[PDB]
JSON list of C-alpha atoms and ligand atoms in Angstrom, two decimals:
[
{"chain": "A", "resi": 5, "resn": "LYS", "atom": "CA", "xyz": [0.00, 0.00, 0.00]},
{"chain": "A", "resi": 6, "resn": "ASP", "atom": "CA", "xyz": [1.06, 3.56, 0.77]},
{"chain": "A", "resi": 7, "resn": "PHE", "atom": "CA", "xyz": [2.95, 3.50, 4.07]},
{"chain": "A", "resi": 8, "resn": "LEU", "atom": "CA", "xyz": [1.60, 5.72, 6.83]},
{"chain": "A", "resi": 9, "resn": "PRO", "atom": "CA", "xyz": [3.61, 8.35, 8.75]},
{"chain": "A", "resi": 10, "resn": "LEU", "atom": "CA", "xyz": [5.77, 7.60, 11.78]},
{"chain": "A", "resi": 11, "resn": "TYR", "atom": "CA", "xyz": [2.99, 9.43, 13.59]},
{"chain": "A", "resi": 12, "resn": "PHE", "atom": "CA", "xyz": [0.17, 11.94, 13.15]},
{"chain": "A", "resi": 13, "resn": "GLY", "atom": "CA", "xyz": [-0.05, 15.13, 15.16]},
{"chain": "A", "resi": 14, "resn": "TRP", "atom": "CA", "xyz": [-0.33, 18.90, 15.34]},
{"chain": "A", "resi": 15, "resn": "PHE", "atom": "CA", "xyz": [2.93, 20.65, 14.47]},
{"chain": "A", "resi": 16, "resn": "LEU", "atom": "CA", "xyz": [3.39, 24.10, 15.94]},
{"chain": "A", "resi": 17, "resn": "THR", "atom": "CA", "xyz": [4.36, 27.05, 13.78]},
{"chain": "A", "resi": 18, "resn": "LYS", "atom": "CA", "xyz": [7.80, 28.62, 14.13]},
{"chain": "A", "resi": 19, "resn": "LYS", "atom": "CA", "xyz": [6.28, 31.45, 16.21]},
{"chain": "A", "resi": 20, "resn": "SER", "atom": "CA", "xyz": [4.34, 29.20, 18.59]},
{"chain": "A", "resi": 21, "resn": "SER", "atom": "CA", "xyz": [7.24, 26.78, 18.90]},
{"chain": "A", "resi": 22, "resn": "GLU", "atom": "CA", "xyz": [9.60, 29.60, 19.95]},
{"chain": "A", "resi": 23, "resn": "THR", "atom": "CA", "xyz": [7.14, 30.93, 22.49]},
{"chain": "A", "resi": 24, "resn": "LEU", "atom": "CA", "xyz": [6.41, 27.57, 24.11]},
{"chain": "A", "resi": 25, "resn": "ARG", "atom": "CA", "xyz": [10.07, 26.47, 24.04]},
{"chain": "A", "resi": 26, "resn": "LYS", "atom": "CA", "xyz": [11.21, 29.63, 25.85]},
{"chain": "A", "resi": 27, "resn": "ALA", "atom": "CA", "xyz": [8.40, 29.26, 28.38]},
{"chain": "A", "resi": 28, "resn": "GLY", "atom": "CA", "xyz": [9.61, 25.75, 29.07]},
{"chain": "A", "resi": 29, "resn": "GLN", "atom": "CA", "xyz": [13.20, 26.92, 29.49]},
{"chain": "A", "resi": 30, "resn": "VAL", "atom": "CA", "xyz": [12.18, 29.70, 31.88]},
{"chain": "A", "resi": 31, "resn": "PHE", "atom": "CA", "xyz": [10.11, 27.22, 33.90]},
{"chain": "A", "resi": 32, "resn": "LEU", "atom": "CA", "xyz": [13.09, 24.87, 34.19]},
{"chain": "A", "resi": 33, "resn": "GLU", "atom": "CA", "xyz": [15.37, 27.71, 35.30]},
{"chain": "A", "resi": 34, "resn": "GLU", "atom": "CA", "xyz": [12.87, 29.01, 37.87]},
{"chain": "A", "resi": 35, "resn": "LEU", "atom": "CA", "xyz": [11.89, 25.58, 39.23]},
{"chain": "A", "resi": 36, "resn": "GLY", "atom": "CA", "xyz": [15.45, 24.36, 39.79]},
{"chain": "A", "resi": 37, "resn": "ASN", "atom": "CA", "xyz": [16.30, 27.62, 41.57]},
{"chain": "A", "resi": 38, "resn": "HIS", "atom": "CA", "xyz": [13.19, 27.38, 43.74]},
{"chain": "A", "resi": 39, "resn": "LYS", "atom": "CA", "xyz": [13.52, 26.72, 47.48]},
{"chain": "A", "resi": 40, "resn": "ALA", "atom": "CA", "xyz": [10.70, 24.16, 47.50]},
{"chain": "A", "resi": 41, "resn": "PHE", "atom": "CA", "xyz": [12.34, 22.15, 44.71]},
{"chain": "A", "resi": 42, "resn": "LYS", "atom": "CA", "xyz": [15.75, 22.17, 46.38]},
{"chain": "A", "resi": 43, "resn": "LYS", "atom": "CA", "xyz": [14.24, 20.55, 49.49]},
{"chain": "A", "resi": 44, "resn": "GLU", "atom": "CA", "xyz": [12.98, 17.54, 47.53]},
{"chain": "A", "resi": 45, "resn": "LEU", "atom": "CA", "xyz": [16.05, 16.93, 45.34]},
{"chain": "A", "resi": 46, "resn": "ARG", "atom": "CA", "xyz": [16.56, 13.60, 47.12]},
{"chain": "A", "resi": 47, "resn": "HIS", "atom": "CA", "xyz": [13.20, 12.40, 45.75]},
{"chain": "A", "resi": 48, "resn": "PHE", "atom": "CA", "xyz": [14.29, 13.52, 42.26]},
{"chain": "A", "resi": 49, "resn": "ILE", "atom": "CA", "xyz": [17.74, 11.94, 41.85]},
{"chain": "A", "resi": 50, "resn": "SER", "atom": "CA", "xyz": [20.31, 9.80, 43.64]},
{"chain": "A", "resi": 56, "resn": "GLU", "atom": "CA", "xyz": [24.12, 21.27, 45.77]},
{"chain": "A", "resi": 57, "resn": "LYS", "atom": "CA", "xyz": [21.87, 22.64, 43.04]},
{"chain": "A", "resi": 58, "resn": "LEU", "atom": "CA", "xyz": [20.64, 20.84, 39.94]},
{"chain": "A", "resi": 59, "resn": "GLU", "atom": "CA", "xyz": [20.57, 22.65, 36.60]},
{"chain": "A", "resi": 60, "resn": "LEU", "atom": "CA", "xyz": [17.34, 21.32, 35.07]},
{"chain": "A", "resi": 61, "resn": "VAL", "atom": "CA", "xyz": [17.92, 22.65, 31.55]},
{"chain": "A", "resi": 62, "resn": "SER", "atom": "CA", "xyz": [20.98, 20.38, 31.33]},
{"chain": "A", "resi": 63, "resn": "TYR", "atom": "CA", "xyz": [19.25, 17.51, 33.18]},
{"chain": "A", "resi": 64, "resn": "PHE", "atom": "CA", "xyz": [16.63, 17.42, 30.42]},
{"chain": "A", "resi": 65, "resn": "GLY", "atom": "CA", "xyz": [19.37, 17.38, 27.81]},
{"chain": "A", "resi": 66, "resn": "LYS", "atom": "CA", "xyz": [17.44, 15.52, 25.12]},
{"chain": "A", "resi": 67, "resn": "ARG", "atom": "CA", "xyz": [15.11, 18.17, 23.69]},
{"chain": "A", "resi": 68, "resn": "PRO", "atom": "CA", "xyz": [13.15, 18.59, 20.45]},
{"chain": "A", "resi": 69, "resn": "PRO", "atom": "CA", "xyz": [15.58, 20.15, 17.94]},
{"chain": "A", "resi": 70, "resn": "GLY", "atom": "CA", "xyz": [13.11, 22.13, 15.81]},
{"chain": "A", "resi": 71, "resn": "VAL", "atom": "CA", "xyz": [9.39, 22.85, 15.79]},
{"chain": "A", "resi": 72, "resn": "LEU", "atom": "CA", "xyz": [7.33, 21.36, 18.61]},
{"chain": "A", "resi": 73, "resn": "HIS", "atom": "CA", "xyz": [4.37, 19.02, 18.21]},
{"chain": "A", "resi": 74, "resn": "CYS", "atom": "CA", "xyz": [1.43, 17.39, 19.94]},
{"chain": "A", "resi": 75, "resn": "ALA", "atom": "CA", "xyz": [1.17, 13.81, 18.71]},
{"chain": "A", "resi": 76, "resn": "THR", "atom": "CA", "xyz": [-2.15, 12.03, 18.18]},
{"chain": "A", "resi": 77, "resn": "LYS", "atom": "CA", "xyz": [-1.47, 8.49, 16.90]},
{"chain": "A", "resi": 78, "resn": "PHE", "atom": "CA", "xyz": [1.90, 6.73, 16.71]},
{"chain": "A", "resi": 79, "resn": "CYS", "atom": "CA", "xyz": [1.65, 4.64, 13.54]},
{"chain": "A", "resi": 80, "resn": "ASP", "atom": "CA", "xyz": [5.25, 3.49, 12.94]},
{"chain": "A", "resi": 81, "resn": "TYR", "atom": "CA", "xyz": [4.57, 3.42, 9.20]},
{"chain": "A", "resi": 82, "resn": "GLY", "atom": "CA", "xyz": [1.65, 1.02, 9.69]},
{"chain": "A", "resi": 83, "resn": "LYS", "atom": "CA", "xyz": [3.46, -1.39, 12.00]},
{"chain": "A", "resi": 84, "resn": "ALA", "atom": "CA", "xyz": [1.70, -0.07, 15.10]},
{"chain": "A", "resi": 85, "resn": "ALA", "atom": "CA", "xyz": [-1.67, -1.55, 16.08]},
{"chain": "A", "resi": 86, "resn": "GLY", "atom": "CA", "xyz": [-4.63, 0.57, 15.01]},
{"chain": "A", "resi": 87, "resn": "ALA", "atom": "CA", "xyz": [-2.43, 2.67, 12.74]},
{"chain": "A", "resi": 88, "resn": "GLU", "atom": "CA", "xyz": [-4.30, 1.74, 9.57]},
{"chain": "A", "resi": 89, "resn": "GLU", "atom": "CA", "xyz": [-7.64, 2.01, 11.34]},
{"chain": "A", "resi": 90, "resn": "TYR", "atom": "CA", "xyz": [-6.64, 5.48, 12.51]},
{"chain": "A", "resi": 91, "resn": "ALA", "atom": "CA", "xyz": [-5.42, 6.83, 9.17]},
{"chain": "A", "resi": 92, "resn": "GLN", "atom": "CA", "xyz": [-8.53, 5.62, 7.33]},
{"chain": "A", "resi": 93, "resn": "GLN", "atom": "CA", "xyz": [-10.89, 7.78, 9.41]},
{"chain": "A", "resi": 94, "resn": "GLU", "atom": "CA", "xyz": [-12.69, 10.47, 7.43]},
{"chain": "A", "resi": 95, "resn": "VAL", "atom": "CA", "xyz": [-12.01, 13.10, 10.09]},
{"chain": "A", "resi": 96, "resn": "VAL", "atom": "CA", "xyz": [-8.26, 12.43, 9.84]},
{"chain": "A", "resi": 97, "resn": "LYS", "atom": "CA", "xyz": [-8.21, 12.56, 6.03]},
{"chain": "A", "resi": 98, "resn": "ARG", "atom": "CA", "xyz": [-10.43, 15.65, 6.17]},
{"chain": "A", "resi": 99, "resn": "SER", "atom": "CA", "xyz": [-8.36, 17.45, 8.82]},
{"chain": "A", "resi": 100, "resn": "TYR", "atom": "CA", "xyz": [-5.05, 16.69, 7.08]},
{"chain": "A", "resi": 101, "resn": "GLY", "atom": "CA", "xyz": [-3.21, 19.98, 6.60]},
{"chain": "A", "resi": 102, "resn": "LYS", "atom": "CA", "xyz": [-5.70, 22.11, 8.53]},
{"chain": "A", "resi": 103, "resn": "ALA", "atom": "CA", "xyz": [-5.02, 24.71, 11.21]},
{"chain": "A", "resi": 104, "resn": "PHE", "atom": "CA", "xyz": [-5.80, 24.29, 14.89]},
{"chain": "A", "resi": 105, "resn": "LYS", "atom": "CA", "xyz": [-5.22, 26.16, 18.13]},
{"chain": "A", "resi": 106, "resn": "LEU", "atom": "CA", "xyz": [-4.04, 24.06, 21.08]},
{"chain": "A", "resi": 107, "resn": "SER", "atom": "CA", "xyz": [-4.62, 25.23, 24.64]},
{"chain": "A", "resi": 108, "resn": "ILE", "atom": "CA", "xyz": [-1.69, 24.82, 27.07]},
{"chain": "A", "resi": 109, "resn": "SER", "atom": "CA", "xyz": [-2.95, 24.51, 30.65]},
{"chain": "A", "resi": 110, "resn": "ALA", "atom": "CA", "xyz": [0.22, 23.58, 32.53]},
{"chain": "A", "resi": 111, "resn": "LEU", "atom": "CA", "xyz": [3.92, 22.78, 32.43]},
{"chain": "A", "resi": 112, "resn": "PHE", "atom": "CA", "xyz": [5.21, 19.71, 34.29]},
{"chain": "A", "resi": 113, "resn": "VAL", "atom": "CA", "xyz": [8.45, 18.06, 35.38]},
{"chain": "A", "resi": 114, "resn": "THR", "atom": "CA", "xyz": [9.36, 14.62, 36.68]},
{"chain": "A", "resi": 115, "resn": "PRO", "atom": "CA", "xyz": [12.61, 12.70, 37.12]},
{"chain": "A", "resi": 116, "resn": "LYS", "atom": "CA", "xyz": [12.11, 11.46, 33.54]},
{"chain": "A", "resi": 117, "resn": "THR", "atom": "CA", "xyz": [10.43, 14.17, 31.43]},
{"chain": "A", "resi": 118, "resn": "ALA", "atom": "CA", "xyz": [9.49, 17.82, 31.06]},
{"chain": "A", "resi": 119, "resn": "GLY", "atom": "CA", "xyz": [6.47, 18.82, 29.02]},
{"chain": "A", "resi": 120, "resn": "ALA", "atom": "CA", "xyz": [3.34, 20.89, 28.50]},
{"chain": "A", "resi": 121, "resn": "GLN", "atom": "CA", "xyz": [-0.24, 19.76, 29.07]},
{"chain": "A", "resi": 122, "resn": "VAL", "atom": "CA", "xyz": [-2.59, 20.22, 26.12]},
{"chain": "A", "resi": 123, "resn": "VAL", "atom": "CA", "xyz": [-6.36, 20.47, 26.61]},
{"chain": "A", "resi": 124, "resn": "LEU", "atom": "CA", "xyz": [-8.02, 19.46, 23.35]},
{"chain": "A", "resi": 125, "resn": "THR", "atom": "CA", "xyz": [-11.22, 20.99, 22.03]},
{"chain": "A", "resi": 126, "resn": "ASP", "atom": "CA", "xyz": [-14.20, 18.77, 21.21]},
{"chain": "A", "resi": 127, "resn": "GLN", "atom": "CA", "xyz": [-13.25, 19.01, 17.53]},
{"chain": "A", "resi": 128, "resn": "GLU", "atom": "CA", "xyz": [-9.61, 18.14, 18.20]},
{"chain": "A", "resi": 129, "resn": "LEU", "atom": "CA", "xyz": [-10.63, 15.13, 20.30]},
{"chain": "A", "resi": 130, "resn": "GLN", "atom": "CA", "xyz": [-12.21, 13.68, 17.15]},
{"chain": "A", "resi": 131, "resn": "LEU", "atom": "CA", "xyz": [-8.61, 13.26, 15.98]},
{"chain": "A", "resi": 132, "resn": "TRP", "atom": "CA", "xyz": [-7.55, 11.56, 19.21]},
{"chain": "A", "resi": 133, "resn": "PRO", "atom": "CA", "xyz": [-7.12, 7.81, 18.67]},
{"chain": "A", "resi": 134, "resn": "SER", "atom": "CA", "xyz": [-9.54, 5.23, 20.05]},
{"chain": "A", "resi": 135, "resn": "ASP", "atom": "CA", "xyz": [-7.39, 2.11, 20.32]},
{"chain": "A", "resi": 140, "resn": "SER", "atom": "CA", "xyz": [-4.77, 1.18, 31.98]},
{"chain": "A", "resi": 141, "resn": "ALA", "atom": "CA", "xyz": [-2.88, 4.46, 32.33]},
{"chain": "A", "resi": 142, "resn": "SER", "atom": "CA", "xyz": [-5.78, 6.15, 30.55]},
{"chain": "A", "resi": 143, "resn": "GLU", "atom": "CA", "xyz": [-8.39, 4.66, 32.92]},
{"chain": "A", "resi": 144, "resn": "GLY", "atom": "CA", "xyz": [-10.65, 6.99, 34.88]},
{"chain": "A", "resi": 145, "resn": "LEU", "atom": "CA", "xyz": [-9.54, 10.15, 33.08]},
{"chain": "A", "resi": 146, "resn": "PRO", "atom": "CA", "xyz": [-11.34, 12.02, 30.28]},
{"chain": "A", "resi": 147, "resn": "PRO", "atom": "CA", "xyz": [-10.32, 11.19, 26.69]},
{"chain": "A", "resi": 148, "resn": "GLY", "atom": "CA", "xyz": [-7.25, 13.04, 25.40]},
{"chain": "A", "resi": 149, "resn": "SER", "atom": "CA", "xyz": [-5.81, 13.66, 28.87]},
{"chain": "A", "resi": 150, "resn": "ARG", "atom": "CA", "xyz": [-2.53, 12.21, 27.61]},
{"chain": "A", "resi": 151, "resn": "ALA", "atom": "CA", "xyz": [-2.27, 15.09, 25.11]},
{"chain": "A", "resi": 152, "resn": "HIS", "atom": "CA", "xyz": [1.03, 16.91, 25.60]},
{"chain": "A", "resi": 153, "resn": "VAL", "atom": "CA", "xyz": [3.98, 18.68, 24.04]},
{"chain": "A", "resi": 154, "resn": "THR", "atom": "CA", "xyz": [7.34, 17.23, 25.03]},
{"chain": "A", "resi": 155, "resn": "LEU", "atom": "CA", "xyz": [9.97, 19.76, 26.12]},
{"chain": "A", "resi": 156, "resn": "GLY", "atom": "CA", "xyz": [12.77, 17.57, 27.46]},
{"chain": "A", "resi": 157, "resn": "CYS", "atom": "CA", "xyz": [13.83, 14.09, 28.52]},
{"chain": "A", "resi": 158, "resn": "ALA", "atom": "CA", "xyz": [16.47, 12.67, 30.87]},
{"chain": "A", "resi": 159, "resn": "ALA", "atom": "CA", "xyz": [19.38, 10.83, 29.23]},
{"chain": "A", "resi": 160, "resn": "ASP", "atom": "CA", "xyz": [18.02, 7.26, 29.22]},
{"chain": "A", "resi": 161, "resn": "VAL", "atom": "CA", "xyz": [14.30, 8.05, 28.78]},
{"chain": "A", "resi": 162, "resn": "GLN", "atom": "CA", "xyz": [12.19, 7.71, 25.61]},
{"chain": "A", "resi": 163, "resn": "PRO", "atom": "CA", "xyz": [9.61, 10.50, 25.11]},
{"chain": "A", "resi": 164, "resn": "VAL", "atom": "CA", "xyz": [6.77, 7.97, 24.99]},
{"chain": "A", "resi": 165, "resn": "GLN", "atom": "CA", "xyz": [7.43, 8.43, 28.70]},
{"chain": "A", "resi": 166, "resn": "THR", "atom": "CA", "xyz": [6.23, 12.05, 28.62]},
{"chain": "A", "resi": 167, "resn": "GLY", "atom": "CA", "xyz": [2.62, 11.05, 27.98]},
{"chain": "A", "resi": 168, "resn": "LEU", "atom": "CA", "xyz": [2.70, 8.43, 30.73]},
{"chain": "A", "resi": 169, "resn": "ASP", "atom": "CA", "xyz": [4.24, 10.95, 33.11]},
{"chain": "A", "resi": 170, "resn": "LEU", "atom": "CA", "xyz": [1.44, 13.43, 32.39]},
{"chain": "A", "resi": 171, "resn": "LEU", "atom": "CA", "xyz": [-1.27, 10.79, 32.86]},
{"chain": "A", "resi": 172, "resn": "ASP", "atom": "CA", "xyz": [0.22, 9.70, 36.19]},
{"chain": "A", "resi": 173, "resn": "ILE", "atom": "CA", "xyz": [0.23, 13.34, 37.29]},
{"chain": "A", "resi": 174, "resn": "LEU", "atom": "CA", "xyz": [-3.42, 13.83, 36.36]},
{"chain": "A", "resi": 175, "resn": "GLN", "atom": "CA", "xyz": [-4.27, 10.62, 38.24]},
{"chain": "A", "resi": 176, "resn": "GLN", "atom": "CA", "xyz": [-2.83, 12.46, 41.27]},
{"chain": "A", "resi": 177, "resn": "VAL", "atom": "CA", "xyz": [-4.48, 15.87, 40.77]},
{"chain": "A", "resi": 178, "resn": "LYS", "atom": "CA", "xyz": [-7.74, 13.92, 40.34]},
{"chain": "A", "resi": 183, "resn": "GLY", "atom": "CA", "xyz": [-3.75, 20.21, 47.17]},
{"chain": "A", "resi": 184, "resn": "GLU", "atom": "CA", "xyz": [-2.36, 23.58, 48.22]},
{"chain": "A", "resi": 185, "resn": "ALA", "atom": "CA", "xyz": [0.28, 25.49, 46.26]},
{"chain": "A", "resi": 186, "resn": "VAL", "atom": "CA", "xyz": [3.86, 25.33, 47.57]},
{"chain": "A", "resi": 187, "resn": "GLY", "atom": "CA", "xyz": [5.10, 28.21, 45.43]},
{"chain": "A", "resi": 188, "resn": "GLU", "atom": "CA", "xyz": [4.21, 31.17, 43.24]},
{"chain": "A", "resi": 189, "resn": "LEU", "atom": "CA", "xyz": [5.86, 31.64, 39.84]},
{"chain": "A", "resi": 190, "resn": "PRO", "atom": "CA", "xyz": [5.36, 34.61, 37.47]},
{"chain": "A", "resi": 191, "resn": "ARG", "atom": "CA", "xyz": [3.12, 32.55, 35.17]},
{"chain": "A", "resi": 192, "resn": "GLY", "atom": "CA", "xyz": [1.13, 30.75, 37.86]},
{"chain": "A", "resi": 193, "resn": "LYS", "atom": "CA", "xyz": [1.01, 28.35, 40.79]},
{"chain": "A", "resi": 194, "resn": "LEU", "atom": "CA", "xyz": [3.58, 25.63, 41.43]},
{"chain": "A", "resi": 195, "resn": "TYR", "atom": "CA", "xyz": [2.42, 22.32, 42.90]},
{"chain": "A", "resi": 196, "resn": "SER", "atom": "CA", "xyz": [4.52, 19.59, 44.53]},
{"chain": "A", "resi": 197, "resn": "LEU", "atom": "CA", "xyz": [2.87, 16.24, 43.79]},
{"chain": "A", "resi": 198, "resn": "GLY", "atom": "CA", "xyz": [5.50, 14.03, 45.45]},
{"chain": "A", "resi": 199, "resn": "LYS", "atom": "CA", "xyz": [7.83, 11.45, 43.90]},
{"chain": "A", "resi": 200, "resn": "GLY", "atom": "CA", "xyz": [9.78, 14.27, 42.26]},
{"chain": "A", "resi": 201, "resn": "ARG", "atom": "CA", "xyz": [6.75, 15.45, 40.27]},
{"chain": "A", "resi": 202, "resn": "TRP", "atom": "CA", "xyz": [6.07, 19.14, 39.69]},
{"chain": "A", "resi": 203, "resn": "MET", "atom": "CA", "xyz": [3.27, 21.09, 38.01]},
{"chain": "A", "resi": 204, "resn": "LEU", "atom": "CA", "xyz": [2.95, 24.73, 37.04]},
{"chain": "A", "resi": 205, "resn": "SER", "atom": "CA", "xyz": [-0.70, 25.68, 36.53]},
{"chain": "A", "resi": 206, "resn": "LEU", "atom": "CA", "xyz": [-0.80, 28.66, 34.19]},
{"chain": "A", "resi": 207, "resn": "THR", "atom": "CA", "xyz": [-2.91, 31.58, 35.40]},
{"chain": "A", "resi": 208, "resn": "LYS", "atom": "CA", "xyz": [-3.42, 32.35, 31.73]},
{"chain": "A", "resi": 209, "resn": "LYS", "atom": "CA", "xyz": [-3.83, 29.38, 29.40]},
{"chain": "A", "resi": 210, "resn": "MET", "atom": "CA", "xyz": [-1.36, 29.64, 26.53]},
{"chain": "A", "resi": 211, "resn": "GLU", "atom": "CA", "xyz": [-2.56, 29.30, 22.94]},
{"chain": "A", "resi": 212, "resn": "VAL", "atom": "CA", "xyz": [-0.33, 27.80, 20.27]},
{"chain": "A", "resi": 213, "resn": "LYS", "atom": "CA", "xyz": [-1.08, 27.61, 16.55]},
{"chain": "A", "resi": 214, "resn": "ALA", "atom": "CA", "xyz": [-0.43, 24.34, 14.74]},
{"chain": "A", "resi": 215, "resn": "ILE", "atom": "CA", "xyz": [-1.09, 22.29, 11.60]},
{"chain": "A", "resi": 216, "resn": "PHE", "atom": "CA", "xyz": [-2.42, 18.73, 11.62]},
{"chain": "A", "resi": 217, "resn": "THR", "atom": "CA", "xyz": [-0.26, 16.51, 9.43]},
{"chain": "A", "resi": 218, "resn": "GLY", "atom": "CA", "xyz": [1.94, 13.40, 9.39]},
{"chain": "A", "resi": 219, "resn": "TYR", "atom": "CA", "xyz": [5.63, 13.05, 10.25]},
{"chain": "A", "resi": 220, "resn": "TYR", "atom": "CA", "xyz": [7.77, 10.63, 8.23]},
{"chain": "A", "resi": 221, "resn": "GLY", "atom": "CA", "xyz": [11.32, 11.63, 9.13]},
{"chain": "B", "resi": 1, "resn": "2AM", "atom": "N1", "xyz": [4.75, 4.26, 21.67]},
{"chain": "B", "resi": 1, "resn": "2AM", "atom": "C1", "xyz": [4.34, 5.49, 21.36]},
{"chain": "B", "resi": 1, "resn": "2AM", "atom": "N2", "xyz": [3.02, 5.85, 21.54]},
{"chain": "B", "resi": 1, "resn": "2AM", "atom": "C2", "xyz": [2.61, 7.13, 21.21]},
{"chain": "B", "resi": 1, "resn": "2AM", "atom": "N3", "xyz": [3.52, 8.04, 20.72]},
{"chain": "B", "resi": 1, "resn": "2AM", "atom": "C3", "xyz": [4.82, 7.69, 20.54]},
{"chain": "B", "resi": 1, "resn": "2AM", "atom": "C4", "xyz": [5.24, 6.41, 20.86]},
{"chain": "B", "resi": 1, "resn": "2AM", "atom": "N4", "xyz": [6.56, 6.33, 20.60]},
{"chain": "B", "resi": 1, "resn": "2AM", "atom": "C5", "xyz": [6.99, 7.52, 20.12]},
{"chain": "B", "resi": 1, "resn": "2AM", "atom": "N5", "xyz": [5.92, 8.38, 20.08]},
{"chain": "B", "resi": 1, "resn": "2AM", "atom": "C6", "xyz": [5.97, 9.78, 19.60]},
{"chain": "B", "resi": 1, "resn": "2AM", "atom": "O1", "xyz": [6.56, 9.74, 18.32]},
{"chain": "B", "resi": 1, "resn": "2AM", "atom": "C7", "xyz": [7.87, 10.27, 18.33]},
{"chain": "B", "resi": 1, "resn": "2AM", "atom": "C8", "xyz": [8.86, 9.25, 17.77]},
{"chain": "B", "resi": 1, "resn": "2AM", "atom": "O2", "xyz": [10.01, 9.90, 17.29]},
{"chain": "B", "resi": 1, "resn": "2AM", "atom": "C9", "xyz": [8.19, 10.67, 19.76]},
{"chain": "B", "resi": 1, "resn": "2AM", "atom": "O3", "xyz": [8.76, 11.96, 19.80]},
{"chain": "B", "resi": 1, "resn": "2AM", "atom": "C10", "xyz": [6.86, 10.65, 20.47]},
{"chain": "B", "resi": 1, "resn": "2AM", "atom": "O4", "xyz": [6.36, 11.97, 20.53]},
{"chain": "B", "resi": 1, "resn": "2AM", "atom": "P1", "xyz": [6.01, 12.71, 21.91]},
{"chain": "B", "resi": 1, "resn": "2AM", "atom": "O5", "xyz": [7.28, 13.30, 22.47]},
{"chain": "B", "resi": 1, "resn": "2AM", "atom": "O6", "xyz": [5.04, 13.83, 21.65]},
{"chain": "B", "resi": 1, "resn": "2AM", "atom": "O7", "xyz": [5.41, 11.73, 22.90]}
]
């Protein structure tokens, strides 16, 4: 047949990618320098940690929010995903993604995406997902620790939302900082950030 992409997703514009990337960097700088984070460094790893370097594996270019990992058809449900009318119809079209929070764990750094009803139509329907609304996994990856694979980022977000399912420990310029234990951190943005993106397929 025609082989599918490596994955489908929304790919941020240059502009939006810059803006979100910087926001992520600033968050990492602020968080690592924050008194509340320094107290819990023993629950984060095994003197201050520079989190921008810790998350050394970062997206090189434009950022994205993946929908369905297809691995060129080899992944289960890949064909069944690509054949959908709403996918074929939305291919190449513009969307705005809403960023609700930035998060950090011992494994990944990322941004939480809250999909619109329309965008959720593009979310795949193939135990981490249990109990949470559809599309909760939706994220943009900002960084990964050396031996992590950024499939981890989605799992990390889901685990975090399973927790949030109390009171702020800190105040950052962009919002409230929450300490969720086990080295997990969440910045809830006072103002949700809007990024512009195009739905398409990555081949690489
Ligand atoms: N098993 C998987 N399930 C869903 N998405 C995956 C995946 N493995 C890789 N991906 C996504 O596809 C890319 C493969 O190069 C990764 O960057 C990852 O994007 P992500 O960072 O947004 O999660």
